[PDB]
Design a protein around this nucleic acid. Structure first.
Lengths: 176, 137, 198, 128, 109, 96
RNA sequence: GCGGUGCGCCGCGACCGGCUCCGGGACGGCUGGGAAGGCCCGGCGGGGAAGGUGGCCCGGGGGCCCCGGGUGUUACAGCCCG
RNA sequence: UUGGUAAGCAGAACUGGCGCUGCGGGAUGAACCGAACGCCGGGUUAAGGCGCCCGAUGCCGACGCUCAUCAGACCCCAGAAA
RNA sequence: GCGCCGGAGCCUCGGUUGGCCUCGGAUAGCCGGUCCCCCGCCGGGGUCCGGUGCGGAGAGCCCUUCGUCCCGGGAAACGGGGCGGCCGGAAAGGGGGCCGCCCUCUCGCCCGUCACGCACCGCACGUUCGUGGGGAACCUGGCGCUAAACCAUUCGUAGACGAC
């Protein structure tokens, strides 16, 4: 799946056409994280065709709009239940993240899983994302950020843009 | 031997980026390579990596859960701008900016003044040379 | 047009690509002091690379094909020849423009530049191991390690005395500004507004 | 292009010199003229492409110009001979240039100097 | 008196993997390595200055051995410093990596 | 992942006096002087406190493989201090 | 003097139209008839925690000041929900 | 899909190709991908790259993985198991 | 009839438009001064003081030519130009330092006052290292010199011929 840039939220609702037998189909809501509304509605039809008896030709889409985060400044510790497909067999995992925005956390999740286990996101589902309290976190790399009294230097300061000067006399010290 | 520690609530000078040439305080450390305010030049709260920053040795005690109001109050109470003006590096940043935006007529006048200063060198340093030769021989 | 380039702690390919880029554009390059060149990897692989280069020989007559040169300047000339199209006339002109020697013999009293792109602390991690080139040359047959090192100490003792005399001239530079500060104070203020002293 | 600025003469036999600009002619050519003692520049016409300007704008509010000079006066007729009218006109223009350039300190050295490059000078980096 | 021309170097020609185009020339000025920094020289004239055996006449002077080939700078090339140009007559393969003059009197200031 | 800090303090006695310069220390005491270079591991030393009572070592942002080499250098330093203060007596017999 | 055709050689300048590339500015709709943002601890007004904040206790580094661990929900600071 | 245990083997149903067709990339190449051809000038692309050999990542690119005492560099296409 | 150091001239050739003349190494640590205290024939060892996005910053230093008259102000007279000794000088020897003098004036450079130059009037190779490299003769001061190789003659310790 093309993870082009950051993710965008789309509150997608849809149903089937009004039948002469029943009055109305049961409406459902899905919060799809997708690059745009076209693939958001495509994944909506994907999950609806997997779950219920509904086809895209005999159906309709009621609303597909973006809503923003009500608290962007507050930090939230998300926990994502990963449903993926391996090269040999299929397995599931669970991994936490620490980021402000849900779109940023989901954006970091694709790069992290593609770095660890080569996540090809064409057949990878996200079944549940929920915020977690600080005491209930499992990962030590997440729990190590929870430190009010912290005081530490940086180990190394690598410098960039070395082709633009291209010449120097003294040796630059990276200790800053 | 490390003098400047990365501490929560430390004034840092932004080297480059959108807020080029501005001071910022480390509010929160959320990610491993992403920091998280400048009320003097009205810096909006956003994320920033550790590459485009140059930290200084100035801190004060304040909780990180406070919003922009108490950060602005602590900034105006601590008065970082006077210490930044007393800092020797900011006094030569403007000197480098004047040397960049130096007028060619002003450059010609400074060139003639340095020519006279080099003739003062050619007299006075030669007098120190003959004085050192009198001290040696 | 002449650039003297130091070769302490500089990589092979990273410096060689920059030299091959700058010579073909046209600039006389004098590569000096190639004794502290390190290559990433352990002492097994950095030896068996040269051992594979030795095994890649000519069976019919070895006095016609490749020659396994022992000098690090000739090894650097070999890899510059391997990178550049040496069959072409522009490559033959680059061979005349390029000047590579080991150590530092006749223009030793010059300032030299450092390429930061081929630097070890810039490119490699500090936890990585390395192997010396002069030790491998002395093990394979280069005999002029003790000849070069004693001649290297002779110019270091001369530069020790001359820089100390250069330090002695620096005390006379600052002390002369203190004596004549009455008349140059008007000359001091016109440079402080432009920002040359500060 | 403003009246009163310093220009770098290029296309003439005198090149690299710093000449004070007077005014725009009605024909279109830039009439530019320096001091007869300092820059040795006569009443010469240049072109806006061939003129490189330099940002140094002195006051040129209190000057005057005669009306007998025109586009047909500064024409290449044929053996160059200096007429007696050109010397009087150059003296009359130099008498108006003189008090301002004498009031501005260290300006005659910049006028008598010539432009020349050296090591580590490229005009796209620094500013004039 | 002094120098009145910046240091430009002819780098090469517009070429693909095997084919080459001799009509478009590639130039590189010493001291500039950016597309935003090379915007000042859009329209400045270039001249490959060389010499010959025969004495060709000089406009406003005695005949000399030197000759010129005039050109025109159109626009830049690449990311980190290169510029394109087109001469009146096409340069031979002898003129590879040689010093030229950059006439700046067609100014835009 | 890279652990930010794992300190290990060494409570040296008063009789063992050290004076660091970069990554090279000198050890004196009742008898014997021993010196050893520490440039290869690239760590940070800190000799703190008045009258030099204890030593501290740091390893900033190192993973599981690099933090394992920190504790053994402390054991080598303690063995060097034991060799300076007490020494090493090895007795051994022959079998035929 | 008006109109028209052309130069013995080498170049430059100007305006007009067409085809492209780039830069500096200014104006207007929609969103949840936008989330959020700074100003008057905004007053009244009920409750809760920890990356534990004032303060208390324990132990050691400096001749009266700081560190690590517990007590705590505002306290010589924050803070989320009505 | 048949015959063989498997082949650069033989024989069959659908589309496209050399023969009758060169150019761009894949190092060299009957079939791979893109795209098909009058002669020039200007602008701009697919397939493909932007350490050098030749034009570009010389982006102040990010995430993390791997130390090997026989790593790794691409569909055909030139090497592998438990 | 040939050559070492200092004219009227003449063919051929290629890049050029100022030099940067210098300790060392650390990179999770250094640079620069006093070095009161010791080892050393005058240098290090610590102790101290300022800087660390490095001003003892190669993103830096110096030269700068339009020229010439006169009167001044600091500027400077101990200085600029050259002849004679004393040292340094070889990984592939620099045309480097100092002192006396045969010789010269307070002119050079930084600011005020005045005058002059073919001012060539709108179109370009100007600007340079140049006593630049190579080949031929024509001139004139000081100073030295009158050589060898090959074919061939004898040799077998050589040997198809050369070759030794």
């Amino acid at each position: 799946m093309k993870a082009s840039g950051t993710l965008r939220e789309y509150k997608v609702v849809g149903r089937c056409l009004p039948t002469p037998k029943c009055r109305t189909p049961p409406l459902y809501r899905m919060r799809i994280f997708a690059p745009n509304h076209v693939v958001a509605k495509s994944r909506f039809w994907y999950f609806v065709s997997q779950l219920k008896k509904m086809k895209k030709s005999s159906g309709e889409i009621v609303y597909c709009g973006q809503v923003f985060e009500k608290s962007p400044l507050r930090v939230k510790n998300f926990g994502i239940w990963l449903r993926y497909d391996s090269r040999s067999g299929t397995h599931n995992m669970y991994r936490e993240y620490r980021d402000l925005t849900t779109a940023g956390a989901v954006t970091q999740c694709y790069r992290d899983m593609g770095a660890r286990h080569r996540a090809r996101a064409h057949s990878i589902q996200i079944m549940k994302v929920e915020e977690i309290a600080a005491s209930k976190c499992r990962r030590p790399a997440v729990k190590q950020f929870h430190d009010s009294k912290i005081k530490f230097p940086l180990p190394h300061r690598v410098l960039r843009r070395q082709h633009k000067p291209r010449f120097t006399t003294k040796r630059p010290n990276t200790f800053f | 031997v490390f003098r400047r520690f990365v501490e929560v609530g430390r004034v840092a000078y932004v080297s480059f980026g959108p807020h080029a040439g501005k001071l910022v305080a480390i509010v929160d450390v959320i990610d491993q390579n992403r920091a998280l305010d400048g009320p003097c030049t009205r810096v909006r709260r956003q994320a920033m990596p550790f590459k485009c920053m140059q930290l200084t040795d100035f801190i004060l005690k304040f909780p990180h859960s406070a919003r922009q109001k108490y950060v602005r109050k602590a900034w105006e109470k601590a008065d970082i701008n006077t210490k930044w003006a007393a800092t020797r590096w900011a006094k030569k940043i403007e000197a480098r900016e004047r040397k960049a935006k130096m007028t060619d007529f002003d450059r010609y006048k400074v060139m003639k003044a340095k020519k006279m200063r080099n003739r003062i060198i050619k007299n006075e340093v030669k007098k120190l040379q003959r004085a050192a030769l009198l001290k040696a021989s | 047009q002449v650039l003297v380039l130091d070769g302490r702690g500089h990589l092979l390919g990273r410096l060689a690509a920059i030299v091959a880029k700058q010579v073909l554009l046209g600039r006389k390059v004098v590569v000096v002091r190639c004794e502290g060149i390190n290559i990433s990897g352990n002492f097994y692989r950095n030896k068996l690379k040269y051992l594979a280069f030795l095994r890649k020989r000519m069976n019919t007559n070895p006095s016609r094909g490749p020659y396994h040169f022992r000098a690090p300047s000739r090894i650097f000339w070999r890899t510059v020849r391997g990178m550049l199209p040496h069959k072409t006339k522009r490559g033959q002109a680059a061979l005349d423009r390029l000047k590579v020697f080991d150590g530092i013999p006749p223009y030793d009293k010059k300032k030299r530049m450092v390429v930061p792109a081929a630097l070890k602390v810039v490119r490699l991690k500090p936890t990585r191991k390395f192997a010396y080139l002069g030790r491998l040359a002395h093990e394979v047959g280069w005999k002029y390690q003790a000849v070069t090192a004693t001649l290297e100490e002779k110019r270091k003792e001369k530069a020790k005395i001359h820089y100390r005399k250069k330090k002695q001239l620096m005390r006379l530079r600052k002390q002369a500004e203190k004596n004549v500060e009455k008349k140059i104070s008007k000359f001091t203020d016109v440079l402080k507004t432009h920002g040359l002293l500060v | 292009i403003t009246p009163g600025t310093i220009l770098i003469i290029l296309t003439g036999r005198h090149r690299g010199k710093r000449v004070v600009f007077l005014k725009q002619l009605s024909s279109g050519l830039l009439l530019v003229t320096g001091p007869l003692s300092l820059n040795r520049v006569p009443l010469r016409r240049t072109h806006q492409k061939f003129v490189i300007a330099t940002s140094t704008k002195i006051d040129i509010s209190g000057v005057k110009i005669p009306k007998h000079l025109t586009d047909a006066y500064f024409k290449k007729k044929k053996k160059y001979e200096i007429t007696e009218q050109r010397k009087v006109d150059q003296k009359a223009v130099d008498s108006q240039i003189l008090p301002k350039i004498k009031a501005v300190p260290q300006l005659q050295g910049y006028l008598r100097s010539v432009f020349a490059l050296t090591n580590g000078v490229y005009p796209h980096k620094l500013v004039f | 008196s002094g120098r009145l021309w910046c240091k430009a170097i002819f780098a090469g020609y517009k070429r693909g993997l095997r084919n080459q185009r001799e009509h478009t020339a590639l130039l590189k000025i010493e001291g500039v390595y950016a597309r935003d920094e090379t915007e000042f020289y859009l329209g400045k004239r270039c001249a490959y200055v060389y010499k010959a055996k025969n004495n060709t006449v000089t406009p406003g002077g005695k005949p000399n051995k030197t000759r010129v080939i005039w050109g025109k700078v159109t626009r830049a090339h690449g990311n980190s410093g290169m510029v394109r140009a087109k001469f009146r007559s096409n340069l031979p393969a002898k003129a590879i990596g040689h010093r030229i003059r950059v006439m700046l009197y067609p100014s835009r200031i | 992942m890279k652990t930010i800090l794992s300190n290990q303090t060494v409570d040296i006695p008063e009789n063992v006096d050290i004076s660091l310069k970069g990554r090279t220390v000198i050890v004196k005491g009742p008898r014997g002087t021993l010196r050893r270079d520490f440039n290869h591991i690239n760590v940070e030393l800190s000799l703190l406190g008045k009258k030099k009572k204890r030593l501290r070592v740091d390893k900033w942002w190192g993973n599981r493989k690099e933090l394992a080499t920190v504790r053994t250098i402390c054991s080598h330093v303690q063995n060097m201090i034991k060799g300076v203060t007490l020494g090493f007596r090895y007795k051994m017999r022959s079998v035929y």
